[PDB]
Amino acid sequence: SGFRKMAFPSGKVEGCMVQVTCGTTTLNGLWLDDVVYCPRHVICTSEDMLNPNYEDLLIRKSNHNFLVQAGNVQLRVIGHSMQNCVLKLKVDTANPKTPKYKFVRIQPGQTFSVLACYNGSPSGVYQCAMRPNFTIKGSFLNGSCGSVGFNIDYDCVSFCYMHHMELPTGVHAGTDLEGNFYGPFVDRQTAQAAGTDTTITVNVLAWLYAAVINGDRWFLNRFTTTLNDFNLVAMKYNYEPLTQDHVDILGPLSAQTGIAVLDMCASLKELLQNGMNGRTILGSALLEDEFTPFDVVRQCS
Numbered sequence: 001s002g003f004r005k006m007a008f009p010s011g012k013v014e015g016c017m018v019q020v021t022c023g024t025t026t027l028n029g030l031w032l033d034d035v036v037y038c039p040r041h042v043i044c045t046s047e048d049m050l051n052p053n054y055e056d057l058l059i060r061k062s063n064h065n066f067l068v069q070a071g072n073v074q075l076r077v078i079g080h081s082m083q084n085c086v087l088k089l090k091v092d093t094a095n096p097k098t099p100k101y102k103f104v105r106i107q108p109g110q111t112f113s114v115l116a117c118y119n120g121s122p123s124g125v126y127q128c129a130m131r132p133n134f135t136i137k138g139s140f141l142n143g144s145c146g147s148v149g150f151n152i153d154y155d156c157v158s159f160c161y162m163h164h165m166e167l168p169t170g171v172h173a174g175t176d177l178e179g180n181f182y183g184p185f186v187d188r189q190t191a192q193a194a195g196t197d198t199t200i201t202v203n204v205l206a207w208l209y210a211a212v213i214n215g216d217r218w219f220l221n222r223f224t225t226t227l228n229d230f231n232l233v234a235m236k237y238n239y240e241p242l243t244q245d246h247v248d249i250l251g252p253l254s255a256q257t258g259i260a261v262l263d264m265c266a267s268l269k270e271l272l273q274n275g276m277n278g279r280t281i282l283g284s285a286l287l288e289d290e291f292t293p294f295d296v297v298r299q300c301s
């Protein structure tokens, strides 16, 4: 029993983190095989920020300008190249701790674990979701750029996020490991801001199922709704539309609890319209949307 924000064990990723320094800027890199990946803004200077031409900035670099350190061991850079908004620094040594891995871009509403790192040293690990507006509500301080987000399937690390920036509202943005930003954010100085966000409906329903599995039942009712009528309510409360695919994805949890999805939808509608009247669900006084159906199954059997 119990239900927590649970991250994947981080050991396989810890062994991949290195420190990358260019000029006076130090941040984190990801060392896999004989390549270190890091944000390309490591080559920026304070004066470059309005409209850096990264192609020019990189042509002006040499391998010796990148200092890469894996703990107390310096790695020799033997090649450098840009891939979208990341840099690929080829090093003379393959990382002996390289896990089986994949680079995998995630969808809004998916979750992942973040290993926050400073000066190439892991500091902590927490669970995050990719918001509908392609930001993440992370916890990151100066020096954390190049920290990565990941999931683990069996022995294989699926890297899905590399950290690049903090937006004015305190939320975060970054890229996939191919260097392509999530959302309409750019690695240059602008007034960019997180766009309007919505609540991830399928995840709220998954979390309601988690609650039922853990003995919280007060919000259940005898009613069922139609998908159409539920989506009318969803729109009014800034929730994402619920699709039949979502209903299908929730099938296993519906079967385990004996509560049909559209029955749970009627409970959600009442919670949106009436609130919780001073009660809590899984220790929360608000509807939590950062657990996916898979996250719930993983933790609730």
Ligand SMILES: O=C(NCc1cccs1)[C@@H]1CN(C(=O)c2cccnc2)CCN1c1ccc(Cl)c(Cl)c1
Pocket: 041, 044, 049, 140, 141, 142, 143, 144, 145, 164, 165, 166, 167, 186, 187, 188, 189, 190
């Ligand atoms: O968001 C940033 N600056 C505003 C922006 C300026 C241009 C685009 S965003 C980050 C903040 N920095 C942190 O270490 C940090 C702090 C807190 C939480 N996570 C990270 C240093 C680097 N800095 C940066 C510099 C140049 C570029 Cl181009 C980019 Cl993308 C990022």
